[PDB]
Every structure is written in C-alpha cells, then in structure tokens.
C-alpha cells in the first residue's frame, strides 16, 4: 500500500475487454476499452498511466502480461518495476472481484446514456473516482501522493 | 490559477491532430492523438480528463468546440463549466505556443523509438510531466489539489 503501487485488472463486457489499473492504497482507477488484451495494448496503457501518475510498481493481471517483452519494454521505458499479481494476501482476490462487479453495476446504470461502451466505461470511472465512502478515491490518491512528495 | 482550471489546446503533426489539456496553475498535461478535432472527440477527451482530475472549468481551444452541443453535453455530464479561451491576458497565447513547441521538440527526440505517433506523444507527455524546472508539473498539480482539499 505505498504511494506508487498499482494493480492491473482485465474484465470483459459486450464481447470487449476493459483494462483497469487500480491504485491499491486509494482504490482510484483508470480504465480503457480494447478489443482484446495484448502485450502491445497493455504496454501502451501503462505508458499512458505512468505519464499521468508516479507509477513505481505495477502488479500485472496475468502471467501473459508479466511475460510479454513489450510490456517489459514499456515498464523499462517508464521506470516501472513490473511484478507478478499473485494474491499472497487472499483479500486481494476478493477486492478486485468486487471492484469488477461495482464497475459493471455502474456501467449498467449509465449504459443507456451512451452509444459506445467506451463512453459508458469512462462515465463509470468518473462515478467510481468521485464516490464518497468521508473522502473519494480521487481525493485519497492526491492526499497520499502529496504526503509522499512532502 | 485555481486548482480546477484547465485549458484545451490542439496542435498538428504528421497530418494528425494532438489534443492537449493543460492544468494552468501547474503546467501538467494530458494529450491524445485523433485523426481530426471533432466535437465528439473533444467531448470524449474531456469526459476522460474529468474522471481522472477534479476539473471545474475548461477554457475551450476554439469557437467550434465552445459552440459544439456534444462538448456542452459532456461538460454538463461531468460537471464542468465550459468557458471560452480568449487570451484576455496576452501572456496566454505565448505560453500555449511555447508549450506546443516544447512538446514537438520532445516528440522529435523520441520519435524514432516508436512506430506510431500516439506512442511518441505519450512519451512526450511523460517527459513533460516529470521534468524538474525544483518541482515537476506532476508534483505541482498534486500539491495544488491536495492543498485545496485540505
């Protein structure tokens, strides 16, 4: 749970793939829709994420993205330590599952406002990050990182 | 120079369009490559930005994106006040031009490491945001927003 730790997570809807990165200490997320999970898509997403937040370590979502030399090349480029995503703490499995279920719930709630799934997913990212549970995940991530810079 | 104010900026390279959002107070940026600058592209980009940072006001980059009902709909959805980008302070034109020149310089410096321009642009976003000029823009934006929350 340090300021620079993120977890990748890949979930499926409408025959498409939603790739999510989770900042583990705050639960803030960034996500995108891609037609399938490849090392090249995953690598590009990580390059995007690391330009926007100070990404120190990423726990990859599966062994294909851990092995992928393209993902390792992007983590080299961006200065990220690529790690496995083994739930040594069994709580991690459950936390990710129920986030996927929350996001899919939200996507359902908005899905009728968007023609394309990618709009719905970005509406869901906005609702997740602004939800007060008291602070939101977007507030918690800035607090944590600012505390670290100081 | 409030924590929530952003400026849109659109520049061209390689026959393609790079859309950039600038957090005015810090100089932090987010950017993407699109084939052309339509209201639907600009609206989706603002929906992405506002799910990731607390975007209160956007100064649009031109009068077509100010007029566009699709951009107004995204700003309504995401709770953003859409404003014009008139440089009442003439310092503004100059700052934006100098940023586009800096990004294009960076993109040149990386361009041969990437097959696709979108990779190069995200490398340039990462270098711009991490550059110490002393704090980086990525550090300044987190400090500013954390100060505002507190």
């Amino acid at each position: 749970s340090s300021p620079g730790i993120w977890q990748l997570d890949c979930t499926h809807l409408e025959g498409k793939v939603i790739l999510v990165a989770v900042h583990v200490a705050s639960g803030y997320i960034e996500a995108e829709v891609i037609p399938a999970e490849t090392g090249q898509e995953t690598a590009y997403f990580l390059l995007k994420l690391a330009g926007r937040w100070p990404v120190k370590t990423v726990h990859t979502d599966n062994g294909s993205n851990f092995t992928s030399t393209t993902v390792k090349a992007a983590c080299w480029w961006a200065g990220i330590k690529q790690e496995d995503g083994i739930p040594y703490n069994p709580q991690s499995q459950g936390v990710i599952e129920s986030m996927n279920k929350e996001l899919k719930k939200i996507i359902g709630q908005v899905r009728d406002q968007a023609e394309h799934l990618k709009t719905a997913v970005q509406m869901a990212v906005f609702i997740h990050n602004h939800k007060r549970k008291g602070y939101s995940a977007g507030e918690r991530i800035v607090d944590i990182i600012a505390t670290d810079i100081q | 120079s409030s924590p929530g104010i952003w400026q849109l900026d659109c520049t061209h390279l390689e026959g393609k369009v790079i859309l950039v959002a600038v957090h005015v107070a810090s100089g932090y940026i987010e950017a993407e490559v699109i084939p052309a600058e339509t209201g639907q592209e600009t609206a989706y980009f603002l929906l992405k930005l506002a799910g990731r940072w607390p975007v209160k006001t956007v100064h649009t980059d031109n009068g077509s994106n100010f007029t566009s009902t699709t951009v107004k709909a995204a700003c309504w959805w995401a709770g953003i006040k859409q404003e014009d980008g008139i440089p009442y302070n003439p310092q503004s034109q100059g700052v934006i031009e100098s940023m586009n020149k800096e990004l294009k310089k960076i993109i040149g410096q990386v361009r041969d490491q990437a097959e696709h321009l979108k990779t190069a642009v995200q490398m340039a976003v990462f270098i711009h945001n991490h550059k110490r000029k002393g704090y980086s823009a990525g550090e300044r934006i987190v400090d500013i927003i954390a100060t505002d929350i507190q």
Binding site: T69, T70, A74 | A114, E115, H116, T119, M123
Partner: peptide
C-alpha cells in the same frame, strides 16, 4: 520493428 511499440 525495433520500436518500443513494435519490438519486431
């Protein structure tokens, strides 16, 4: 291709 986004 000897590029970060296309290692071939």
């Amino acid at each position: 291709a000897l590029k970060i986004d296309n290692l071939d």
